[PDB]
Design a protein that fits this description.
mainly alpha; two-stranded antiparallel sheet; globular; RNA-binding
Length: 126
């Protein structure tokens, strides 16, 4: 078989981003201003998760997640660096996973992953 290990979200964000500096461009011309609309969408959801007492995610929140997937695919259609970024980050199967588990802790973990993705993208830029 093979031999794989336990990497938290921060470590793997750093790895994906720094492994997508090629010869210098980031994910083929990504910048952070291209992710702004997305960042805001994530932020507006983060706070509403933070205020939720229980871990069981409200159903309107799931609709919001569906719309988040939709805004993702929009930006991926708009800008090719966003398309590469979203594929190589596994953004979509992770959004799916969050939607299935419907837990608050898990979505906040996803938010940390997204936040570190953007930070590291920022640290490596033109």
């Amino acid at each position: 078989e093979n031999l794989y290990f336990q990497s938290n979200a921060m470590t793997f964000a750093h790895e994906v981003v720094k492994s997508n500096v090629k010869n210098q461009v980031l994910f083929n011309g990504l910048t952070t201003s291209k992710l702004r609309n997305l960042m805001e969408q994530v932020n507006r959801l983060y706070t509403i998760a933070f205020n939720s007492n229980e871990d069981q995610l409200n159903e309107e929140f799931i609709d919001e997640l569906e719309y988040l997937k939709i805004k993702f695919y929009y930006e991926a259609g708009r800008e090719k660096s966003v398309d590469e970024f979203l594929k190589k980050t596994l953004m979509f199967p992770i959004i799916d996973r969050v939607i299935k588990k419907e837990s608050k802790k898990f979505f906040l973990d996803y938010c940390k992953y997204f936040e570190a993705l953007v930070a590291y993208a920022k640290y490596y830029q033109k």
